[PDB]
Amino acid sequence: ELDQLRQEAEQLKNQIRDARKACADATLSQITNNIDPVGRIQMRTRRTLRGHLAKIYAMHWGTDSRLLVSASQDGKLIIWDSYTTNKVHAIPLRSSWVMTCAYAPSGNYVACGGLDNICSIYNLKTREGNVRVSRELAGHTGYLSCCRFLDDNQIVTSSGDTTCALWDIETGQQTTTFTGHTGDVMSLSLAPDTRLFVSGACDASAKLWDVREGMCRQTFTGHESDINAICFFPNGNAFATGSDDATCRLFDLRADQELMTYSHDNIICGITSVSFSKSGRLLLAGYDDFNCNVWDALKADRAGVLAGHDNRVSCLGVTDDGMAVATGSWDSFLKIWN
Amino acid sequence: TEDQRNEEKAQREANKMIEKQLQKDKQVYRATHRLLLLGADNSGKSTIVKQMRIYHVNSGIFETKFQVDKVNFHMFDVGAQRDERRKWIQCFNDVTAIIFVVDSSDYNRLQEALNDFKSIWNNRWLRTISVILFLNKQDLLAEKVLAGKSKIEDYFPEFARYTTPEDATPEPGEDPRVTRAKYFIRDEFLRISTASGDGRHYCYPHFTCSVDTENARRIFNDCRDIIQRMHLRQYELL
Amino acid sequence: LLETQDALYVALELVIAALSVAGNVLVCAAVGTANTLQTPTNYFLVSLAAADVAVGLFAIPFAITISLGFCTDFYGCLFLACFVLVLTQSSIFSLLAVAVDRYLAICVPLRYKSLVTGTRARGVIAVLWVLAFGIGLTPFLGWNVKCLFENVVPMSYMVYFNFFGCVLPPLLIMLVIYIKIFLVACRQLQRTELTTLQREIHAAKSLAMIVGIFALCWLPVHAVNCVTLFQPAQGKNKPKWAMNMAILLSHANSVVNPIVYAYRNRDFRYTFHKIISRYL
Amino acid sequence: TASIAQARKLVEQLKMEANIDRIKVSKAAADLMAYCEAHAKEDPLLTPVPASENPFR
Amino acid sequence: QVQLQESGGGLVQPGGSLRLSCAASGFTFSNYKMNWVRQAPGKGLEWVSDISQSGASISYTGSVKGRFTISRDNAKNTLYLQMNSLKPEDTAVYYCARCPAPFTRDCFDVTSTTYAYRGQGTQVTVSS
Ligand SMILES: CC(C)CCC[C@@H](C)[C@H]1CC[C@H]2[C@@H]3CC=C4C[C@@H](O)CC[C@]4(C)[C@H]3CC[C@]12C
Ligand SMILES: CC(C)CCC[C@@H](C)[C@H]1CC[C@H]2[C@@H]3CC=C4C[C@@H](O)CC[C@]4(C)[C@H]3CC[C@]12C
Ligand SMILES: CC(C)CCC[C@@H](C)[C@H]1CC[C@H]2[C@@H]3CC=C4C[C@@H](O)CC[C@]4(C)[C@H]3CC[C@]12C
Ligand SMILES: CC(C)CCC[C@@H](C)[C@H]1CC[C@H]2[C@@H]3CC=C4C[C@@H](O)CC[C@]4(C)[C@H]3CC[C@]12C
Ligand SMILES: Nc1ncnc2c1ncn2[C@@H]1O[C@H](CO)[C@@H](O)[C@H]1O
């Protein structure tokens, strides 16, 4: 009897792709031939955040555009002051194998986690002066790959158990759960609206979810291999992703299809992390080829090449105002380009 | 201006003390050698170091720290994770070694063990990390090959036309068939490793039983040889 | 100043100083710019490079002014001679430290990262620099008009205290170090069963260089001084050629050190490739 | 059982995704270009910010 | 876009032969290593064979080495498994799995059962 369900799903996907091709009356590649190119993007290392020991596995800027988080595999999550490179806090993690990190918009909380299957929270504004474990959001049956702060009392988490979660710091349980993907979720991104969020997994697809509804509203499968990078477009209507196939793709929440594909015959190494600028005109993508590529979001051409990194890039972030960019690779030397 | 100069001085003192603590931690970090532990559920990976100086069970990691010849080793065993080992394994690309145990007594599962060993050896991220093959359960292999209830030819017909190498180290009183099968499995693993081998990472097979206790010294020697070959390559002496 | 042959001496010393300073400044810049090259072994290598830079910039001009045969004050010439000696001993001690680091890394690979760190590296470097300054400046205060070197510095210090105190001891130490390293490489080559003889001969050839080069560099001048002290009255039929070439090789040691130690490491070659690619 | 439940969840997700109102890609491209041209001015990465205003230099 | 359909299988008698086809779409089939695996009724996954991009490197499982033949046609991005002289133990559901990463020689398809890059499964039975 399962043959009937399989045929129904096949027909549903066929009509979906038919509607997609129908709405594909044009393509962003040809429509963007009139605008002026961005040209070569000269970005030099303004400061280097030396001090980390093990390979940095993640990083995330803050709303203040001055402090950033950087978690390493040695069990240390350091808070770096970009303006002066001053170590303000160094949280020692119970599990040395950390795979993510976050920085709440208010800066009062910081999240981390990894193979420990637990999302550890830490308060920076503690009256005791010495930070400590604020909350342990356990329950996931897979490695925590990415995490973002939805609010001071609501947080998002992506684990390798093929499911995403939305927790409340005051409760410590899964306030909401999402089980759309089939592979380990590797990264996600929240939009300025603070209600919708997209996440990519090893299923070579990116799925969208609403914090209130709790059901997958849209799915994209234009990629070829596992998605290891994802970031929301500054406008909140689109988002870019990157796969291990050495290719990035920009999907739109309204077209339900790919309209921009960043790739090159000589770019064989995959992607690890991507991020947009304040305006989205450029698209920064970290590759495991020991360098990062800043493409033109509207033309898909290598406008800038950040070649200074003696390791596989792991994370790339942009400030809330886009004054500078941060790149953390496995060399333990988190660079700050601009 | 003082309202900000005092804050700058306080932040400088904080950064100084934080760097001092970071160096204090880096001391013990560099002093310890981080190893990974992989293997099948039926394998005795959780009992490789029968000594077990200290066994720490984290939220989802079966850590195992110990000391040999004043050198601190920290073998990490990830058991409480999904079967998909293509993403989190990347976290162990800087480990000193990867002890991969195989329950070679289970011939039907020996094929899956060989496939996993191949996928690990051919991994782009573990391409520079040696693999310490601990063929545990050798007593089970001996019993199974002496009982004659299971023929290795059904699972590996090459064993029928295979001959034991000359550089073998036969144990006293061991049956020729037992040694032949053991070294055939060892050479199968060595070939799986050599199919894509290179001077970046090497294999170190070892035959150990479920009741053995000298595994600590074996892992010590394996790590020593691995780091020695790595330094020699860095000096272009290999 | 254009003597029968000291002019060629001055020219060769100038060329040697130029090449040495160029190579060692390149090494220092490569170690400084590249962040991944901030390691203990690289710390010792950049210390050797800085010692060679000081030699080329300070030791060579002082030795030239001395050989030219000036009539400066006694202490004025002794100061330059003692500075030359300090710089030579600092270079020798940096070479010895690099050799000991390689030894601890190869023979003691496990405890290497623990017994050799940044703080320990800089401490050992400072101790070696202080030792060099104390040894070279020893006769300046603890001495047991023609500025010609043999005049201001007697061979007593150049042999009893200099040669057999800070050149021959470290020479034999480096010899034993590289011998043990060759033995370890041979023991490891017979284990990597892939022609083993070719790679064994290549490793032996490399190691023979680092000590034979060290030898042919430091043994000439010190053996000349030894034969002049223990066996005097020889008249030194070919002084302006024998000691000429001896000091020429002793100074060319500065340029020969980095090309044999720095340029021959995989990390240094990778850094150079990355830098020339960035510059393109 | 397991496969049947998985297929049921899959077809439910497909149904939930079918009702999505997909507009032509032309409108999406126009909105993207509008946002770019409106924010490209205040984007330091596209318009070279002077070192005096940039707190990094 | 990423899809791997498979056809063939069915009922066969011992000693016969059968060619199972697998069409993969949504990527560059010439840049990904391919594998054939089989899961028997009630048993776990069992990798059968693997074939590289250009087919220069191929390997088979010792239990079925020689009897099966894996091939790949890049002109039409298709994979083929020609089994000859089948056995009653060959009855199982076969799957054509794609390597997770291109330009690599390491694939973890058989490690998990919920793997994504697979087909609906082609059932094969061997009996009179
Ligand atoms: C002899 C004179 C003329 C030249 C002096 C050179 C000295 C002062 C400079 C040049 C290059 C410098 C080194 C460059 C690289 C590093 C790595 C860093 O992590 C520790 C400091 C260290 C080791 C520096 C120490 C000081 C150094 C050696
Ligand atoms: C001959 C006279 C001029 C001596 C000049 C050499 C001095 C200025 C230079 C040459 C090599 C340099 C050292 C080389 C490397 C290190 C290790 C580093 O971790 C701290 C700095 C330190 C210790 C440097 C300090 C300055 C240094 C000692
Ligand atoms: C031993 C000293 C006193 C004088 C003898 C000079 C010769 C024989 C010595 C001096 C310098 C050394 C050479 C230095 C250069 C090289 C490059 C190396 O890649 C191969 C060996 C080779 C060719 C060495 C061979 C032996 C050599 C040891
Ligand atoms: C001037 C006196 C002291 C000796 C001069 C000989 C020096 C300058 C020459 C002679 C042979 C040369 C070597 C020939 C080949 C190699 C192998 C390669 O990896 C570069 C370094 C090395 C090892 C060279 C280093 C410089 C070298 C050793
Ligand atoms: N006989 C000598 N005449 C002149 N200078 C010498 C003599 N022996 C050694 N030196 C100088 O002392 C330094 C240390 O040997 C050498 O670099 C050399 O310049």
Pairing status of strand A238-243 against strand A258-262: unpaired
- Give me the DSSP letters along C136-193: HTHHHHH----B-STTTS-HHIIIIITHHHHTHHHHHHHHHHHHHHHHHHHHHHTT--
* Residue A63 forms contact with D (CB below 8 Å): no
Closest CA to A142 of A174, A177, A116: A116
Rounded-to-integer distance, Cα E88 and Cα E126, Å: 5
C-alpha closest to that of A100 among A112, A118, A117, A116: A112
Rounded to 10°, the helix B176-194/B138-147 angle is 120
Q: How far is CA B93 from CA B28, B70, B97, B128, E70, in A?
A: 20, 25, 9, 8, 33
Q: How far is C248 from chain B (nearest CA, A)?
A: 29
In whole angstroms, give the CA distance from residue B224 to residue B165: 26
Distance CA C19, CA C22 (A): 5
Q: Dump the DSSP string for C4-40.
A: SSHHHHHHHHHHHHHHHHHHHHHHHHHHHH-STT-SH
Please give the number of the atom of ligand 4 that sits closest to the Cα of C264: 19
CATH topology of domain B1-235: Rossmann fold (3.40.50)
Number of helices (H), then strands (E), in chain B: 6, 7
The architecture of the domain spanning D4-56 is Irregular (4.10)
- Tell me how far apart the alpha carbons of residues A183 and E4 are, in angstroms, rounded to a whole number: 16
Q: Is C46 in the pocket of ligand 1 (CB under 6 A)?
A: yes
Strand segments, DSSP code E, in B136-221 are: 206-207
D47 vs A293: CA distance, rounded Å:
18
- Name the residue type at position D40: A
| Helix (H/G/I), strand (E/B), else coil: A241 | strand
Amino acid at C222: H
Tokens 């066996």, located at residue? C231
Burial group, residue A316, by CB count within 10 angstroms (0-12, 13-18, 19+): buried
8 A C-beta contact, residue E61 and residue B111: yes
β partners of residue A98: A114
Cα–Cα distance, A101 to A97 (Å, whole number): 12
Please say whether the beta carbons of D32 and A298 come within 8 A.
yes
Q: How far apart are CA A144 and CA A152, in angstroms?
A: 20
DSSP E113: S
* Backbone phi and psi for residue A292, each to the nearest 5 degrees, phi listed first: -115, 150
User: What residues of A are in contact with residue D57 (Cβ under 8 Å)?
Assistant: 46, 338
Chains contacting chain E through 3 or more C-beta pairs under 8 A: A, B
* Residue A246, phi-psi category: left (phi > 0), alpha (psi -120 to 50), beta (remainder): left
Query: Could you tell me the two tokens for C5?
Result: 């042959």
Q: Do residues C53 and C60 touch, judged by C-beta distance below 8 A? A: no
What DSSP character marks residue E30? G
CB-CB neighbours of D20 under 10 Å: 15
Name the residue ranges covered by the structural domains of chain B. 1-235
| Cα–Cα nearest to A179, from A142, A222, A214, A224 | A214
H or E segment at A283?
strand A282-287
Report chain C residues whose CB lies below 8 A from the CB of A308: 278
For the record, the structure tokens of A55 come out as 């390979």
CA end-to-end distance (rounded Å), chain C: 45
**Amino acid, single-letter form, for residue C182:** F
Between strands B97-101 and B32-39, the pairing is parallel
Residue A287: name the closest of A295, A279, A277 by CA.
Answer: A295
CB A57 within 8 A of CB B91: yes
CA C181 vs CA C207, C208, E99: distances in Å: 8, 11, 43
The 3-state secondary structure of B96-122 reads CEEEEECCCCCHHHHHHHHHHHHHHHC
Of E8, E41, E17, the residue nearest E120 (C-alpha): E8
CATH, range A1-337: 2.130.10.10
Q: Give the closest residue to B194 by CA, choosing from B117, B94, B116.
A: B117
One-letter amino acid of C91: S
Query: Does C259 sit in the ligand 4 pocket, CB within 6 Å?
Result: yes
Q: How is residue E82 written in tokens?
A: 């020609």
**Which pair of structure tokens corresponds to residue B1?**
């201006």
Cβ pair A242, A187 in contact under 8 A: no
Tokens encoding E78? 């298709």
Contact A285, A300 (CB under 8 A): no
Contact A150, A194 (CB under 8 A): yes
- Angle (CA) C197-C198-C203 rounded to 5° is 95
Other Cβ atoms closer than 10 A to D37 = 12
Edge to edge, the sheet with strand B62-68 lists B54-57, B62-68, B71-77, B32-39, B97-101, B131-135, B206-207
Tell me the Cα Rg of chain D: 23
Q: Is C216 in the pocket of ligand 4 (CB under 6 A)?
A: yes
Mutate to test the pocket of ligand 4, among C256, C261, C265 (most ligand atoms within 8 A of CB): C256
Dist. CA C12–CA C63, nearest whole Å? 12
Q: Which long-range contacts (CB under 8 A, 24 or more apart) does E70-79 make?
A: E70/E34, E70/E36, E72/E29, E72/E34, E74/E29, E74/E30, E76/E23, E77/E23, E77/E24, E77/E25, E77/E29, E77/E30, E78/E21, E78/E22, E78/E23, E78/E24, E78/E29, E79/E21, E79/E22, E79/E23, E79/E24, E79/E34, E79/E36, E79/E51
Q: Which of C30, D57, D40, C280 is nearest to A337 (CA)?
A: D57
B203 DSSP β-pair partners: B131
The H or E element that residue A123 is part of is strand A118-123
- Resolution in units of Å: 3.2
Considering only residues 41 to 100 of chain E, which have any Cβ-Cβ distance to chain B shorter than 8 Å?
A: 45-47, 61-63, 65, 100
Task: Name the closest ligand to CA C34.
Answer: 1
Q: How far is CA A182 from CA A205, A209, A241, B144, E114, in A?
A: 9, 15, 17, 40, 7
Q: Which amino acid is at C130?
A: V
Cβ distance B228 to C106 less than 8 Å, yes or no, reads yes
Strands of the A45-49 sheet, one edge to the other? A45-49, A334-337, A325-329, A313-318
In the β-sheet with E92-98, what is the strand arrangement from edge to edge? E10-12, E122-126, E92-98, E34-39, E45-51, E58-60
Output A119-127 pairs: Cβ under 8 A, ≥24 positions apart: A119/A144, A119/A147, A119/A155, A119/A157, A119/A167, A120/A93, A120/A94, A121/A155, A121/A169, A122/A77, A122/A91, A124/A79, A124/A89
CA distance C121 to C44: 7
The two structure tokens encoding residue A332? 């333990």
What per-residue string of b and e applies to B197-231 under the rule 16 or more CB within 10 Å gives b?
A: eeeebbbbbbbbbbebeebbebbbebbbbbbbbbb
Angle at A140 between CA A137 and CA A141, to 5 degrees: 150
- Among A65, A46, A67, A50, smallest CA distance to A337 is for A46
Phi then psi for B57, rounded to 5 degrees? -110, 105
Interface membership of A54 toward D (CB under 8 Å): no
On the CB side of C242, CA atoms within 13 Å amount to 14
Residue recorded with tokens 């105002």:
A321
Q: Residue positions of C in the annotated binding site?
A: 150, 225, 250-251
Alpha-carbon distance of A222 to D11, in angstroms, equals 20
Of D14, D22, D42, the CB nearest to A20: D22
CA distance A178 to A211: 10
Where exactly are the structural domains of chain D? 4-56
Q: Are A144 and A99 in contact (CB under 8 A)?
A: yes
- What is the residue whose two structure tokens read 């693993």? B189
> Are the CB atoms for A48 and A62 separated by under 8 Å?
no
Spell out the alpha helix ranges (H) of chain A.
Answer: 2-23, 28-31
CA distance C8 to C2: 9
Q: Give yes or no for a contact between A41 and D45, defined as CB atoms under 8 angstroms apart.
A: yes
Burial B146-161, CB ≥16 within 10 A → b, else e:
eeeeeebeebbeebee
Where b means 16+ CB within 10 Å and e means fewer, A27-61 reads bbeebbeeeeebeebebeebbebebbbbbbbbbbb
The answer to whether B124 contacts chain E (CB < 8 Å) is yes
Q: Nearest to residue C153, comparing CAs of C84, C101, C233?
A: C84
- Please report, as a single letter, which amino acid is at residue B168: A
| Distance of alpha carbon B135 from alpha carbon B209, whole angstroms | 8
Contact status, residue A88 vs residue B11, Cβ threshold 8 Å: yes
- Spatial CA neighbour of A96 closest among A132, A131, A139, A53: A53
What strands, in cross-sheet order, belong to the sheet with A196-201? Answer: A185-190, A196-201, A206-210, A216-220
Q: Specify whether the CB–CB gap between E96 and A163 falls below 8 A.
A: no
Three-state DSSP state, E109: coil
Name, in order, each residue with C-beta under 8 angstroms of C126's C-beta and a sequence gap of 6 or more.
none
State how far the Cα of B51 lies from the Cα of B211, in Å rounded to an integer: 11
Method: cryo-EM
Facing residues of B206 across strands? B134
Residue with tokens 């070829």, as numbered in its chain? A224
With CA atoms as reference, report the closest residue to B93 among B111, B76, B69, B72: B76
Q: Which ligand is nearest to the CA of C215?
A: 3
Contact A275, A301 (CB under 8 A): no
Domains and CATH numbers, chain E: 3-126 (2.60.40.10)
Q: With H, G, I as helix, E, B as strand and everything else as coil, classify residue A189.
A: strand
Q: State the residue range of the domain holding C165.
A: 1-280
Backbone φ/ψ region at C233: left (φ over 0), alpha (ψ -120 to 50), beta = left
